[PDB]
Write an enzyme that holds these catalytic residues in place. Structure first.
Site, PDB file in Angstrom:
ATOM      1  N   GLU A  35      47.751  16.983 -19.255  1.00 16.56           N
ATOM      2  CA  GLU A  35      47.145  17.499 -20.480  1.00 16.56           C
ATOM      3  C   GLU A  35      47.150  16.501 -21.638  1.00 16.56           C
ATOM      4  O   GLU A  35      46.158  16.362 -22.338  1.00 16.56           O
ATOM      5  CB  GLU A  35      47.780  18.816 -20.897  1.00 16.56           C
ATOM      6  CG  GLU A  35      47.467  19.991 -19.944  1.00 16.56           C
ATOM      7  CD  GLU A  35      46.009  20.435 -19.940  1.00 16.56           C
ATOM      8  OE1 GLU A  35      45.209  19.967 -20.777  1.00 16.56           O
ATOM      9  OE2 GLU A  35      45.659  21.286 -19.108  1.00 16.56           O
ATOM     10  N   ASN A  46      36.471  20.537 -28.561  1.00 25.06           N
ATOM     11  CA  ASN A  46      35.488  20.897 -27.558  1.00 25.06           C
ATOM     12  C   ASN A  46      34.197  21.253 -28.254  1.00 25.06           C
ATOM     13  O   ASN A  46      34.010  22.402 -28.676  1.00 25.06           O
ATOM     14  CB  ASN A  46      35.982  22.122 -26.776  1.00 25.06           C
ATOM     15  CG  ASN A  46      37.320  21.873 -26.093  1.00 25.06           C
ATOM     16  OD1 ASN A  46      37.464  20.922 -25.326  1.00 25.06           O
ATOM     17  ND2 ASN A  46      38.315  22.705 -26.397  1.00 25.06           N
ATOM     18  N   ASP A  49      32.068  24.697 -27.327  1.00 25.78           N
ATOM     19  CA  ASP A  49      32.383  26.052 -27.775  1.00 25.78           C
ATOM     20  C   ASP A  49      33.155  26.152 -29.093  1.00 25.78           C
ATOM     21  O   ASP A  49      33.619  27.219 -29.457  1.00 25.78           O
ATOM     22  CB  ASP A  49      33.095  26.823 -26.667  1.00 25.78           C
ATOM     23  CG  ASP A  49      34.565  26.516 -26.588  1.00 25.78           C
ATOM     24  OD1 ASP A  49      34.987  25.458 -27.077  1.00 25.78           O
ATOM     25  OD2 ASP A  49      35.312  27.360 -26.047  1.00 25.78           O
ATOM     26  N   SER A  51      36.015  25.096 -30.160  1.00 21.19           N
ATOM     27  CA  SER A  51      37.445  25.271 -30.118  1.00 21.19           C
ATOM     28  C   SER A  51      38.094  23.909 -30.021  1.00 21.19           C
ATOM     29  O   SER A  51      37.426  22.916 -29.738  1.00 21.19           O
ATOM     30  CB  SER A  51      37.840  26.122 -28.911  1.00 21.19           C
ATOM     31  OG  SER A  51      37.692  25.407 -27.693  1.00 21.19           O
ATOM     32  N   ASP A  53      41.913  21.944 -28.541  1.00 19.08           N
ATOM     33  CA  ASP A  53      43.139  22.008 -27.757  1.00 19.08           C
ATOM     34  C   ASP A  53      44.233  21.231 -28.501  1.00 19.08           C
ATOM     35  O   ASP A  53      43.976  20.172 -29.075  1.00 19.08           O
ATOM     36  CB  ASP A  53      42.917  21.406 -26.375  1.00 19.08           C
ATOM     37  CG  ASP A  53      41.806  22.092 -25.607  1.00 19.08           C
ATOM     38  OD1 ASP A  53      41.759  23.331 -25.574  1.00 19.08           O
ATOM     39  OD2 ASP A  53      40.985  21.384 -25.016  1.00 19.08           O
ATOM     40  N   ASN A  60      44.582  26.123 -26.257  1.00 18.98           N
ATOM     41  CA  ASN A  60      43.245  26.277 -26.846  1.00 18.98           C
ATOM     42  C   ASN A  60      43.174  27.335 -27.949  1.00 18.98           C
ATOM     43  O   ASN A  60      43.741  28.427 -27.838  1.00 18.98           O
ATOM     44  CB  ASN A  60      42.203  26.536 -25.761  1.00 18.98           C
ATOM     45  CG  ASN A  60      40.780  26.554 -26.307  1.00 18.98           C
ATOM     46  OD1 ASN A  60      40.242  27.616 -26.642  1.00 18.98           O
ATOM     47  ND2 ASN A  60      40.158  25.374 -26.379  1.00 18.98           N
TER      48      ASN A  60
END
Ligand SMILES: [Cl-]
Ligand SMILES: [Cl-]
Ligand SMILES: [Cl-]
Length: 130
Positions: A35, A46, A49, A51, A53, A60
């Site tokens: 990750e 991202n 969409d 969002s 992380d 998220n």
């Protein structure tokens, strides 16, 4: 911060991650490795969409933490996403536990499926005294 491998493993064990809902420490190490490279300050937007992380587990904003800026988002960990960018990973660990209380478990992270699932992950904890 960027954790060294064995320091992190011991840190997660102290925080009760070993075998949490059936998930070995080595699975959690593999997840963190892929990750974020063990980096607590990591963020990834991202574009698709809207969002983001956050942190060592790349949790998220759409479901798990609040950043104010992700549409239609909820906050199931009941945290600011800011809490997931601390050097101290207790909040991140609490939120990762919450993630895996849901039906998918550790499968929620696609990186886990790609890089950890059905693999020999023993190397992640070798020598760490955990
Ligand atoms: Cl396993
Ligand atoms: Cl918070
Ligand atoms: Cl901190």
């Amino acid at each position: 911060k960027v954790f060294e491998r064995c320091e992190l493993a011991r840190t997660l064990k102290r925080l009760g991650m070993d075998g949490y809902r059936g998930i070995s420490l080595a699975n959690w190490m593999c997840l963190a490795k892929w990750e974020s490279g063990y980096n607590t300050r990591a963020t990834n937007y991202n574009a698709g969409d809207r969002s983001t992380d956050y942190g060592i587990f790349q949790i998220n904003s759409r479901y798990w933490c609040n950043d104010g800026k992700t549409p239609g988002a909820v906050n199931a960990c009941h945290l600011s996403c800011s809490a997931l960018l601390q050097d101290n990973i207790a909040d991140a660990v609490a939120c990762a536990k919450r993630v895996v209380r849901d039906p998918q478990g550790i499968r929620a992270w696609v990186a886990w499926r790609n890089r950890c699932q059905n693999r020999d992950v023993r190397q992640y904890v070798q020598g760490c005294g955990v």
